[PDB]
Ligand SMILES: CCCCCCCCCCCCCC(=O)OC[C@H](COP(=O)(O)OCC[N+](C)(C)C)OC(=O)CCCCCCCCCCCCC
Ligand SMILES: CCCCCCCCCCCCCC(=O)OC[C@H](COP(=O)(O)OCC[N+](C)(C)C)OC(=O)CCCCCCCCCCCCC
Ligand SMILES: CCCCCCCCCCCCCC(=O)OC[C@H](COP(=O)(O)OCC[N+](C)(C)C)OC(=O)CCCCCCCCCCCCC
Ligand SMILES: CCCCCCCCCCCCCC(=O)OC[C@H](COP(=O)(O)OCC[N+](C)(C)C)OC(=O)CCCCCCCCCCCCC
Ligand SMILES: CCCCCCCCCCCCCC(=O)OC[C@H](COP(=O)(O)OCC[N+](C)(C)C)OC(=O)CCCCCCCCCCCCC
Ligand SMILES: CCCCCCCCCCCCCC(=O)OC[C@H](COP(=O)(O)OCC[N+](C)(C)C)OC(=O)CCCCCCCCCCCCC
Ligand SMILES: CCCCCCCCCCCCCC(=O)OC[C@H](COP(=O)(O)OCC[N+](C)(C)C)OC(=O)CCCCCCCCCCCCC
Ligand SMILES: CCCCCCCCCCCCCC(=O)OC[C@H](COP(=O)(O)OCC[N+](C)(C)C)OC(=O)CCCCCCCCCCCCC
Ligand SMILES: CCCCCCCCCCCCCC(=O)OC[C@H](COP(=O)(O)OCC[N+](C)(C)C)OC(=O)CCCCCCCCCCCCC
Ligand SMILES: CCCCCCCCCCCCCC(=O)OC[C@H](COP(=O)(O)OCC[N+](C)(C)C)OC(=O)CCCCCCCCCCCCC
Ligand SMILES: CCCCCCCCCCCCCC(=O)OC[C@H](COP(=O)(O)OCC[N+](C)(C)C)OC(=O)CCCCCCCCCCCCC
Ligand SMILES: CCCCCCCCCCCCCC(=O)OC[C@H](COP(=O)(O)OCC[N+](C)(C)C)OC(=O)CCCCCCCCCCCCC
Ligand SMILES: CCCCCCCCCCCCCC(=O)OC[C@H](COP(=O)(O)OCC[N+](C)(C)C)OC(=O)CCCCCCCCCCCCC
């Protein structure tokens with residue numbers, strides 16, 4: 256099962272975001288492109304509609320933070336945790352908080368925001384991990400370029416199991 260166990264449900268269809276704050280590590284244009292491109296994965300396989308606002312409330316608050324920051328959790332440092340993604344719904348939750356003591360880079364063997372944000376939006380929609388050794392929701396990372404990116408049959412099967 257590629258779904259999160261429990262009853263993940265948003266009951267919301269038209270979803271929006273704001274990028275809270277821009278990282279020094281990779282610049283604001285390259286962030287807002289990476290997070291556009293992340294979102295635009297799951298629209299090609301969802302009936303959900305995703306938009307960006309510049310006024311009002313973001314449903315999925317994308318925020319770049321470090322430390323014991325709130326929410327008890329903690330972000331670790333360089334390495335370890337890449338995101339605190341929540342699960343779906345209104346309020347605090349439905350959100351994907353990234354670690355900023357992480358050093359995020361668009362180079363092939365450095366920490367990729369695109370490939371993480373995709374699963375972190377997935378975590379937020381109610382997806383867990385996959386178990387086919389070609390999937391993106393597999394635990395271990397495998398690097399794939401931004402634009403030659405494709406979801407694997409298992410991963411598509413898991414969002415279609417959930418929203419079908
Ligand atoms: C009817 C008559 C009306 C007259 C109107 C006069 C004109 C008013 C114009 C208002 C201009 C408002 C500017 C604006 O919205 O600023 C918002 C910003 C950014 O919003 P946003 O982009 O979400 O920033 C997010 C990132 N973060 C969390 C790192 C801040 O916010 C900031 O960047 C954060 C600012 C923090 C200030 C903190 C001060 C704390 C200590 C002082 C507390 C005093 C309490 C009374
Ligand atoms: C009449 C009774 C007293 C009323 C005066 C009370 C004091 C008002 C304080 C306003 C302080 C303005 C501070 C400022 O520069 O705001 C910039 C905002 C930007 O907000 P935003 O775009 O959210 O910035 C986001 C940053 N990000 C993405 C990295 C997270 O940009 C704006 O939203 C555009 C408007 C900025 C200026 C607003 C105030 C103009 C002057 C107000 C009165 C001055 C009297 C000397
Ligand atoms: C002694 C105790 C009292 C001290 C009072 C201190 C008041 C401090 C006000 C300014 C705080 C600014 C701190 C700061 O650097 O925020 C940076 C962020 C993100 O930085 P980040 O992008 O994380 O990289 C930081 C280093 N960088 C750019 C050189 C590569 O940038 C943002 O997230 C965007 C928001 C930009 C606001 C630009 C506002 C400039 C006006 C500052 C106040 C002017 C009064 C003359
Ligand atoms: C007698 C009790 C009367 C009560 C009347 C209250 C009526 C208020 C009407 C509000 C309608 C417009 C709302 C709207 O479009 O808001 C947009 C912005 C504020 O957006 P906000 O996201 O807060 O700031 C956006 C920019 N950012 C991110 C850089 C900070 O803000 C704007 O762009 C500026 C719009 C100013 C609207 C002034 C309307 C004056 C009508 C006054 C009627 C008689 C009052 C005596
Ligand atoms: C200390 C600082 C001030 C703190 C208080 C500020 C005000 C508190 C109440 C704010 C309520 C704002 C209402 C407002 O946003 O109206 C906006 C509309 C439509 O804007 P729209 O952009 O569609 O909705 C904005 C919000 N958004 C971005 C999240 C989707 O646009 C309007 O429909 C147009 C403007 C109409 C104003 C009419 C005022 C009528 C007064 C009549 C008096 C009759 C006396 C007999
Ligand atoms: C000079 C500038 C100073 C600024 C100081 C801080 C001011 C706090 C402003 C809070 C205003 C929030 C306005 C609000 O309506 O936010 C709504 C968003 C989403 O609402 P949403 O369900 O999308 O639309 C509501 C329904 N509609 C379409 C029928 C209007 O939902 C929210 O984002 C959830 C509510 C957040 C509550 C935050 C309340 C803070 C109170 C303490 C402020 C202390 C400031 C020192
Ligand atoms: C009745 C009135 C109520 C007054 C407010 C009460 C609020 C009480 C609840 C506080 C919750 C604080 C949660 C928290 O730690 O948020 C921190 C955030 C982000 O996490 P963090 O990673 O710490 O941000 C570090 C800087 N960054 C963005 C560049 C990576 O921090 C940021 O994004 C920076 C925001 C601007 C902070 C500028 C400095 C404010 C100094 C004064 C604080 C006054 C508090 C009363
Ligand atoms: C100032 C006069 C001298 C004070 C005596 C100090 C005596 C020893 C105190 C304990 C030693 C603390 C040393 C220190 O600098 O701690 C600062 C802390 C944490 O520093 P640190 O953990 O490096 O910050 C890491 C990064 N961060 C912000 C992203 C989490 O900073 C924070 O965690 C930020 C605190 C934010 C509080 C915001 C308001 C929260 C309570 C509001 C309640 C409102 C209703 C009452
Ligand atoms: C500043 C800008 C940048 C921000 C960067 C990201 C910063 C992250 C801060 C962490 C996020 C903060 C959001 C927040 O409001 O959390 C409040 C928490 C829990 O809210 P809650 O609605 O319980 O959480 C529901 C959703 N959940 C469990 C799935 C997450 O609640 C608590 O923390 C507990 C607080 C004590 C509440 C005690 C009760 C108050 C009412 C008492 C009524 C007494 C009646 C006699
Ligand atoms: C003598 C006993 C008296 C008790 C009176 C009531 C006390 C209620 C507040 C209790 C707070 C206790 C500590 C706690 O739960 O902190 C929660 C988290 C901490 O996560 P953590 O990362 O450990 O925070 C490090 C510190 N920080 C945020 C400054 C970097 O930090 C948060 O997540 C920050 C966000 C907090 C949102 C608070 C919203 C309250 C909404 C209440 C509306 C109803 C009021 C009637
Ligand atoms: C209570 C009298 C307050 C008078 C305030 C007048 C000024 C209001 C300024 C605007 C504040 C925000 C208005 C608001 O509810 O906006 C929507 C947000 C977020 O919407 P969303 O995230 O979609 O959640 C929607 C579902 N909903 C509304 C049922 C929670 O929903 C929320 O953020 C819910 C926030 C709830 C705060 C409840 C505090 C109870 C304290 C104990 C009071 C005891 C009463 C006897
Ligand atoms: C007679 C009637 C009196 C009514 C008084 C109001 C009573 C009801 C208050 C609202 C209660 C909820 C407040 C709260 O927790 O706001 C948090 C929001 C976002 O939390 P949210 O993401 O909505 O989840 C909150 C969950 N909750 C309520 C279960 C804790 O936080 C945010 O949206 C961020 C806001 C950051 C504001 C920082 C302002 C710093 C100072 C700015 C400059 C001031 C210059 C004058
Ligand atoms: C509600 C009543 C009780 C409230 C009690 C709490 C009051 C707290 C007020 C805020 C004090 C700041 C607390 C604190 O030390 O937190 C630590 C932050 C570090 O967080 P952050 O900057 O994210 O971490 C920096 C390091 N980095 C890039 C590797 C991640 O910051 C630092 O370590 C430096 C703190 C610098 C303060 C003075 C800044 C002078 C700036 C001069 C440049 C602007 C001049 C206009």
Ligand SMILES: [Ca+2]
Nearest residue numbers: 332334336354
């Ligand atoms: Ca980390």
Ligand SMILES: [Ca+2]
Nearest residue numbers: 314346348349
């Ligand atoms: Ca949310």
Ligand SMILES: [Ca+2]
Nearest residue numbers: 280355357358
């Ligand atoms: Ca960083």
Ligand SMILES: [Zn+2]
Nearest residue numbers: 325326328339
């Ligand atoms: Zn957290």
Ligand SMILES: [Zn+2]
Nearest residue numbers: 374392393394
């Ligand atoms: Zn993963």
